Design an enzyme around this catalytic site. Structure first.
Site, PDB file in Angstrom:
ATOM      1  N   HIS A  17      54.499-117.917 -33.734  1.00 29.18           N
ATOM      2  CA  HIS A  17      54.492-118.656 -34.129  1.00 29.18           C
ATOM      3  C   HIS A  17      53.523-118.664 -35.487  1.00 29.18           C
ATOM      4  O   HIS A  17      52.601-117.513 -35.092  1.00 29.18           O
ATOM      5  CB  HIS A  17      53.429-119.995 -33.361  1.00 29.18           C
ATOM      6  CG  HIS A  17      52.341-120.156 -32.845  1.00 29.18           C
ATOM      7  ND1 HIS A  17      51.245-119.337 -33.112  1.00 29.18           N
ATOM      8  CD2 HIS A  17      52.425-120.632 -31.309  1.00 29.18           C
ATOM      9  CE1 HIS A  17      50.010-120.036 -32.395  1.00 29.18           C
ATOM     10  NE2 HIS A  17      50.798-120.287 -31.523  1.00 29.18           N
ATOM     11  N   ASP A 274      52.339-115.608 -27.409  1.00 30.50           N
ATOM     12  CA  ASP A 274      51.649-114.754 -27.090  1.00 30.50           C
ATOM     13  C   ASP A 274      52.018-113.772 -26.043  1.00 30.50           C
ATOM     14  O   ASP A 274      52.500-113.109 -24.856  1.00 30.50           O
ATOM     15  CB  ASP A 274      50.430-114.416 -27.881  1.00 30.50           C
ATOM     16  CG  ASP A 274      49.426-115.376 -27.292  1.00 30.50           C
ATOM     17  OD1 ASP A 274      50.041-116.376 -26.183  1.00 30.50           O
ATOM     18  OD2 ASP A 274      48.578-115.713 -28.125  1.00 30.50           O
TER      19      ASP A 274
END
Length: 356
Positions: A17, A274
Site C-alpha cells: 500500500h 511489508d
C-alpha cells in the site's frame, strides 16, 4: 534470446500500500499534526469497487489533527496511481497486451481485507485503466484466519512455535539492543515499552513520506531504525530456516507459481504487506536489505518464444530488473525459475499439515 520473437502471456504484480498515517502513534509529548484534508480523493483516482470473499460472494483510532491511524492519504493515493500508470505504459501503451479499459475477464484482483490495501488497489487500478471499466471491479479477500497474503502466526501453530524463542529474543540481540536503548534514551521515550524498531520505523517513515516535522532525535536515527527493523525481521525468519520460510510465504508462492502454470487471465494483482515482502524477496533470492517501501511492487512477466515454444520469466522489483534464484541475467527459462523456488513453495494441503 531474441525479444522480437517473444510474446507476452501473463503479468503478475504483488504490491504494498502507499504512504499512509502510522498504525500506532509514538508515545511522544509533542506530536505531529495530521490534517484530514490529506484524505481528499483526487478525482483521477476515483474508481468504485466491491469487496468479496475468495469466491465471491459476500465480503468477509484517531491521530492528532483529526485523522485516523493506518489510513492511505492523498500522498499514498498518488503513489499507487503512479504505480498503475507505469504498468499502463508497459502493458497498455508500449504493447497492447491489456485492454486500456478494465476487463473482468482479463484481470484477477486479490487483497488482504484491510482498508489501506483496498484503497491502494483502487488507486492502482485507477492509474492502470485511467478509471475506465467494461464491468464491475471485484476485489477478492479472505478472512484473517485463512489469510496467506502475510505470514499468519495466529492460524499456523508450528510457525508460531518455531519462531517463539527468536520472537522473544530478537530485540535483545547484539547491536539491536544497544541501538534501541540509544534511540529511546535520546528521544526521552525510554521505558515506554513496548516500543520496538517496527513502531519507530512505522512512525518515521510515515512522517517523512508526508513532509511532516518529526521529532529531531527520531529523525537523527531514522537510518539506524530502518536497518535494525530489517535485522530484527531477519533474525526472526532467517534465510537459514527453511521450514519457517515455507510456512511464512509458501502458500503465497504456491499461488504465484499456480498462475504461471495456468497460463501455460492476463493480469493478477495482489495487495500485500511489508512483512510479506521481506521473506518473499528472500526466498526469491532478491532481497536488498531495505525495508520494503510504500507502493513498492514485485512484477513478474511470463513470455513464450514464438519459434521454440519455450517459456521465460522476467522479474522486476521497484522498477528494477532482478535476477532470482536459479536464473541468468535477463529472461529466465521458466523451469529454472520454478525449480529453484520449489524449495520454498507449499501446497495448501502440505501447509495445513505442517502447521499442526
Amino acid at each position: 534470446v531474441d525479444r522480437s520473437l517473444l510474446k507476452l502471456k501473463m503479468v503478475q504484480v504483488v504490491f504494498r500500500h502507499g504512504a499512509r498515517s502510522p498504525l500506532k502513534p509514538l508515545p511522544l509529548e509533542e506530536q505531529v499534526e495530521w490534517n484530514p484534508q490529506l484524505l481528499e480523493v483526487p478525482p483521477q483516482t476515483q474508481f468504485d469497487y466491491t469487496v468479496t470473499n475468495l469466491a465471491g460472494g459476500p465480503k468477509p483510532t484517531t491521530l492528532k489533527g483529526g485523522m485516523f491511524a493506518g489510513q492511505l492519504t492523498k500522498v499514498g493515493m498518488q503513489q499507487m496511481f503512479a504505480l498503475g500508470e507505469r504498468l499502463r505504459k508497459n502493458y497498455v501503451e508500449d504493447i497492447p497486451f491489456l485492454s486500456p479499459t478494465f476487463n473482468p475477464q482479463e484481470v484477477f484482483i486479490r487483497s488482504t481485507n484491510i482498508f489501506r490495501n483496498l484503497e491502494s488497489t483502487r488507486c492502482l487500478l485507477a492509474g492502470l485503466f485511467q478509471c475506465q471499466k467494461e464491468g464491475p471491479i471485484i476485489i477478492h479477500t479472505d478472512e484473517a484466519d485463512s489469510e496467506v497474503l502475510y505470514p499468519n502466526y495466529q492460524s499456523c501453530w508450528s510457525l508460531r512455535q518455531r519462531t517463539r524463542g527468536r520472537r522473544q529474543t530478537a530485540s535483545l540481540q547484539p547491536g539491536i539492543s544497544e541501538d534501541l536503548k540509544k534511540v529511546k534514551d535520546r528521544m526521552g521515550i525510554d521505558s515506554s515499552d513496548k516500543v520496538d524498531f517496527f513502531i519507530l520505523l512505522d512512525n518515521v517513515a510515515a512522517e517523512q513520506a508526508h513532509n511532516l516535522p518529526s521529532c529531531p532525535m527520531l529523525k537523527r536515527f531514522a537510518r539506524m531504525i530502518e536497518q535494525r527493523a530489517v535485522d530484527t525481521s531477519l533474525y526472526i525468519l532467517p534465510k537459514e530456516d527453511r521450514e519457517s520460510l515455507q510456512m511464512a510465504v509458501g502458500p503465497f508462492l504456491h499461488i504465484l507459481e499456480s498462475n504461471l502454470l495456468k497460463a501455460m487471465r492476463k493480469l493478477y494483482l495482489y495487495a500485500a504487506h511489508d512483512v510479506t515482502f521481506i521473506p518473499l524477496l528472500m526466498t526469491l533470492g532478491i532481497f536488498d536489505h531495505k525495508w520494503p517501501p510504500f507502493a513498492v511492487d514485485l512484477t513478474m512477466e511470463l513470455y513464450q518464444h514464438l519459434e521454440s515454444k519455450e517459456w521465460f520469466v522476467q522479474l522486476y522489483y521497484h522498477g528494477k530488473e532482478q535476477v532470482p534464484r536459479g536464473c541468468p541475467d535477463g529472461l529466465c527459462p521458466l523451469d529454472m525459475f520454478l525449480n529453484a523456488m520449489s524449495v520454498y513453495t507449499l501446497s495448501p494441503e502440505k501447509y495445513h499439515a505442517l502447521c499442526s
